[PDB]
Amino acid sequence: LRLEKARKIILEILNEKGRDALYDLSGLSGGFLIDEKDKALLNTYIGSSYFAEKVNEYGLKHLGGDENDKCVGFNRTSSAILATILALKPKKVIHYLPELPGHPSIERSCKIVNAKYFESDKVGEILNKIDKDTLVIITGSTMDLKVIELENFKKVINTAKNKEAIVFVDDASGARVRLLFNQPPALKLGADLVVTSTDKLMEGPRGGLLAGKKELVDKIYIEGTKFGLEAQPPLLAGIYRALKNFNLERIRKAFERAKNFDLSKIEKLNKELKAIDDNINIVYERTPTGFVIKRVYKDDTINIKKLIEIGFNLLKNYGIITITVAGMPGASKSLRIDLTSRDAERIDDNYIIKAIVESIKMAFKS
Amino acid sequence: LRLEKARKIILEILNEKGRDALYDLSGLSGGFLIDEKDKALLNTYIGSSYFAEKVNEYGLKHLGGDENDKCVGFNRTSSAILATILALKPKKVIHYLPELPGHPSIERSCKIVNAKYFESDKVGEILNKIDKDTLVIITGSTMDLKVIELENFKKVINTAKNKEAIVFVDDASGARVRLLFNQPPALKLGADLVVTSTDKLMEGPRGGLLAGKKELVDKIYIEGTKFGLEAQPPLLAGIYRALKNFNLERIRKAFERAKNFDLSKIEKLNKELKAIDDNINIVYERTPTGFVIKRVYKDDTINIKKLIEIGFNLLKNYGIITITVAGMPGASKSLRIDLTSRDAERIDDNYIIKAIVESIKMAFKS
């Protein structure tokens, strides 16, 4: 897994300056935000019950559960899905989602219990398959911001109600995303169960929350504990802190910041650097969460080299962590800035744009 | 889950004094020992690869693996067992263990893959069932300190070798316990795979380590990741710190301390307090890991009440956390002190014995 050189310099910055000098803007970061009180608690037996109770409390509030509901932590959303399918042992699973193909954990879990599986992004193909023997799973959204249409969501729930089928909402991102679109929480729509991810537009570790009718959640949690699928206390502490700190407005503001970010200095630099070399060609794109610099040079092989070099310049000189700083592609390759990142709250637009401009300039010294 | 009153006072001590004033001697504690550098790293994308690499390095060293081996973290030992059985899909699993009955995760995992399962603590019943279609699982020890006889361990491994069967050692405690008995690590005995727990005679969270032939470990880890069975980075950080800090001699010394602990002041107090009330009857027992106070009063109902009260007196006045401080039995009930606990390193015998004597005396004020 080549490129512990990024690991090296991060450790150097940590040693010489400290954690406040590091800014991970890559977007792909688990957020582990526990304090000393939490750490103390995790080193006692009462820690397990303490963080499970806090997760129940703040998770129910987040998921719009009522007094007949419970919320529990799973290691990942996939873990909650496996546990649910193992516990409920449905004959068939019907999966409604915004776009094909789905994430594979549901189908894989079905294969283990020998349940039939069908998926579709067409409400018509979903309704006519619902019966007493089907578990109905609705994925509420994608990180791309596509959502299930509200009227369709209600239609699926209605048919399930008429057929006595259990409705399980995969709100891995949807518990945040659909709410940005002014949709109610899954449990408020009448879902029997909901799962969400603790790091998708939330400042927690990757992790799963499962909430819903006490009886169902209990059965599923017991099943999950047989195989260590449930979240351990250190994970529950990270989840608690993510939930305690969560506010939808923070997310809305970060989307606004990306919408408003002044990227004109990139274009200015582009024109300026052609004095040096007419093959320099900075290509950028505004994104819903920030922006991406897709290329800096016309020749493809040199382009790669410089994007990585710029990534290192950003890390070394400004403490900004991005993807280019790893070894080659496999994931993105382009220099991506995600302004929804927690660390982006610690720096202004001016800092980010200056870091970007100066890091590119440094890469093109004649 | 009655008795957040223990949670309450722990939080009071934490606020008023701090974490160094708390000593969890109950024995049943997950040890989450990460530092600020670790916490910093967990808030970056490079954290996942960093702690996975450290776990591989220190886990291989702990488990006596060679250059052809890898060590990976699972959420729990049960998670590693499920992942292994899901990946290898054996027709039959043969489970050799020191005493019946076994822990259920293996049999439960077998039920999911429709594999046959057999267990026995008799080497004779194990050898004649081994064939090409059997996964052979040897549980090396119990926390009770019973171990598989070395010659039996070698016999099982030999038969498996002759039958081309895979040998998987459940060293959940055995990776420490069997070594106290001067046995080699599982991988050194020729096991293809080994699993151990990161909190059984080790200062880590509950968690699983799976080590062995690179190819096998890779297959199993990929299978585990389908369902979030693998350890997330915050858990890997706790495991790393447990492994880095691990030394067998520390465990040997704690066992010696328990062996040598002067408990005579308990007997002295017993005689002294009969002046007050001839129904007071302190009954204690030395344990391999420390000692237990089993009763303090002849009447059973009052006995219960006072044991809990003493537990609270220990917590309030001396910061010692034990089981009696929770609501009634279900687990132990008696006041147990486990000197293998990390927090026991922060206090001398004098402190513990004085805390115990004074806490009992306080409970019997006339």
User: What pairs with residue B197 in β-bridges?
Assistant: B208
Dihedral of alpha carbons A225, A229, A234, A236, sign = negative
Check B24 against A41: CB less than 8 A apart. no
CATH 3.90.1150.70 maps onto chain B at: 1-28+246-366
Q: Find the closest chain B residue to A103 by CA distance.
A: B226
To 5 degrees, how large is the angle CA B138–CA B142–CA B146? 95
Most distant CA atoms of chain A, gap in Å:
72
Contact of B235 with B207, CB cutoff 8 Å: yes
Query: CATH for A1-28+246-366, among 3.30.70.260, 3.90.1150.70, 3.40.50.920, 3.40.50.9100?
Result: 3.90.1150.70
Long-range contacts of A126-129 (CB under 8 A, 24+ apart): A126/A94, A126/A96, A126/A156, A127/A155, A127/A156, A127/A159, A129/A92, A129/A94
* Residues B88/B233, Cβ–Cβ less than 8 Å: no
Find out whether B57 and B81 touch, Cβ atoms under 8 Å: no
Residues of each domain in chain A carrying CATH 3.40.640.10: 29-245
Percent of chain B as helix, strand, coil, to the nearest 5 = 50, 15, 35
Beta strands in B200-358 (DSSP E): 208-213, 280-286, 290-297, 320-321, 335-338
DSSP B73: E
Map residue B338 onto helix, strand or coil.
strand
Q: Are A28 and B67 in contact (CB under 8 A)?
A: no
Say if CB B142 and CB B173 are below 8 A apart: yes
Residue numbers in A near B205 (CB within 8 A): 42, 232-234
Identify which of B37, B42, B81 has the shortest CB distance to residue A14. B37
Contact B71, B59 (CB under 8 A): yes
**CB contacts < 8 Å between A and B, how many?**
179
Rounded to a whole number of angstroms, the distance from the CA of A220 to the nearest CA of chain B is 15
H helix or E strand, kind and range, residue B51: helix B47-63
Residue type, B301: T
Phi and psi angles of residue B315, each rounded to the nearest 5 degrees, phi first? -65, -55
Q: CA-CA distance, B60 to B69, in Å (whole number)?
A: 8
| Contact assessment for residue B166 and residue B94, using Cβ atoms and an 8 Å cutoff | no
In one letter, which amino acid is B341? S
CB B114 within 8 A of CB B83: no
d(CA B346, CA B349): 10
Nearest to B338 by CA among B352, B350, B317: B352
Question: Two tokens at A144?
Answer: 């791309």
A78 → closest Cβ in B10, B227, B233: B227
Give the helix/strand (H/E) hosting B105.
helix B105-112
| Cis ω for the linkage preceding A101 (within 30 of 0) | yes
Residues in B closer than 8 angstroms to A78, CB to CB, are: 226-228
Which chain B residue lies closest to A82 (C-alpha atoms)? B227
Tell me whether residues B7 and A205 touch, CB distance under 8 A: no
Q: How far apart are the first and last CA of chain A?
A: 32
B43 and A37 within 8 Å at the Cβ level: the answer is: no
Best of B4, B170, B218, B227 to substitute, by most chain A Cβ atoms within 10 angstroms, is: B227
The amino acid occupying position A338 is D
DSSP state, residue B183: P
Q: Is B249 exposed, middle or buried (0-12, 13-18, 19+ CB in 10 A)?
A: exposed
User: Are the beta carbons of B185 and B210 closer than 8 angstroms?
Assistant: no
Tokens of B231: 């350890």
- Torsion sign over Cα A321, A325, A329, A334: positive
First to last CA, chain B: 32
Under DSSP, is residue A194 helix (H, G, I), strand (E, B) or coil?
Answer: strand
**In chain B, which residues are followed by a C-to-N distance beyond 2.5 Å, i.e. a gap?**
none
Range list of H helices, chain A: 5-16, 36-42, 47-63, 77-88, 105-112, 123-127, 150-163, 174-180, 186-189, 214-225, 233-245, 248-260, 264-273, 300-318, 349-363
Picking from B346, B293, B289, B295, the residue whose alpha carbon sits closest to that of residue B320 is: B346
**Domain A29-245 fold:** Aspartate Aminotransferase; domain 2 (3.40.640)
Angle made by CA atoms B234, B105, B255, in degrees to the nearest 5: 70
Packing angle of the helix pair A264-273, A349-363 (nearest 10 deg): 20
Helix (H, G, I), strand (E, B) or coil at A48: helix
* Residue of B5, B38, B44, B325 to mutate for A, most A C-beta atoms under 10 A: B44
Residues of chain A in contact with residue B234, where contact means CB-CB under 8 angstroms, are: 30, 32, 205, 234-235, 238
d(CA B241, CA B243): 5
Q: Would you say B96 and B126 are in contact if contact means Cβ atoms under 8 Å apart? A: yes
Cα separation values, B22 from A49, B310, B327, Å? 17, 16, 20
- The CA distance from A169 to A174, in Å, is 9
Resolution limit, Å:
1.7
Judge contact between B311 and B322, C-beta under 8 A: yes
